[PDB]
Design an enzyme around this catalytic site. Structure first.
Site, PDB file in Angstrom:
ATOM      1  N   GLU A 112       0.773  -1.236   0.000  1.00 12.58           N
ATOM      2  CA  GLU A 112       0.000   0.000   0.000  1.00 12.58           C
ATOM      3  C   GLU A 112       0.821   1.312   0.000  1.00 12.58           C
ATOM      4  OE1 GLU A 112      -3.059  -0.123   3.036  1.00 12.58           O
ATOM      5  OE2 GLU A 112      -3.250   2.056   3.185  1.00 12.58           O
ATOM      6  N   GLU A 120      -2.446  10.750   3.452  1.00 13.00           N
ATOM      7  CA  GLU A 120      -3.439  10.916   4.488  1.00 13.00           C
ATOM      8  C   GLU A 120      -3.330  12.269   5.168  1.00 13.00           C
ATOM      9  OE1 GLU A 120      -2.216   6.937   6.417  1.00 13.00           O
ATOM     10  OE2 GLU A 120      -4.365   6.475   6.040  1.00 13.00           O
TER      11      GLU A 120
END
Ligand SMILES: [Ca+2]
Length: 212
Positions: free
Chosen positions: A103, A107
């Site tokens: 991944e 964020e």
């Protein structure tokens, strides 16, 4: 190489799918609802965080039907501001396509939209967090965020400026493109406590994936 140019003008079921009727469980304190996936009149993906029951929370995630590999990923977005929530843009492969967990993330911790958090997972291992100062408040307008994913590095940019570089155990399985907004539980040290503030919205203008 080839360019995937997604302008997010409307829901195109061939290329995207709305998560619905379930919860990722764990730090995720909310249920994904297709109804929380909207499009503005001027063509923005509008991800919405609601409370459709007293202490019940409805959240949103949009993801790619296809998978992508190395290359440049750019997004133009506007994160939500609040304690206890994350607004993100990331690549993701896990058991999703019967593989290990790889991944790449972008964020925004809603408790401090003046910063961004970079991070990556390679075979289920992370702890690569990197927090940088924006010099601006992300929640006020659209800005451009990207990562360049090649076989020996990841490079993060903001409004065109190299902000971060990662060189070790760089992921390699292809994955889907994902966008989601959610309230965390028992990560307070990380996200701050969610006060139930709602409704909250994170906005996306476009996505571009440029191959090679
Ligand atoms: Ca658009």
């Amino acid at each position: 190489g080839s360019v995937f140019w997604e302008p997010l003008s409307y829901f195109n079921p061939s290329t995207w799918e709305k998560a619905d009727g379930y919860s990722n469980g764990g730090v995720f304190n909310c249920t994904w609802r297709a109804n929380n996936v909207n499009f503005t009149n001027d063509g923005k993906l509008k991800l919405g965080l609601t409370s459709s029951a007293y202490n019940k929370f409805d959240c949103a995630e949009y993801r790619s039907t296809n998978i992508y590999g190395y290359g440049l990923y750019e997004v133009s977005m506007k994160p939500a501001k609040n304690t206890g929530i994350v607004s993100s843009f990331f690549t993701y492969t896990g058991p999703a396509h019967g593989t290990q967990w790889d991944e790449i993330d972008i964020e925004f911790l809603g408790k401090d939209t003046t910063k961004v958090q970079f991070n990556y997972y390679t075979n289920g291992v992370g702890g690569h967090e990197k927090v940088i100062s924006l010099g601006f408040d992300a929640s006020k307008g659209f800005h451009t965020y990207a990562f360049d994913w090649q076989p020996g590095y990841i490079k993060w940019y903001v409004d065109g400026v190299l902000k971060h570089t990662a060189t070790a155990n760089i992921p390699s399985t292809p994955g889907k493109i994902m966008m989601n907004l959610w309230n965390g539980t028992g990560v307070d040290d990380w996200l701050g406590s969610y006060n139930g503030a709602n409704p909250l919205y994170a906005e996306y203008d476009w996505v571009k994936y440029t191959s090679n």
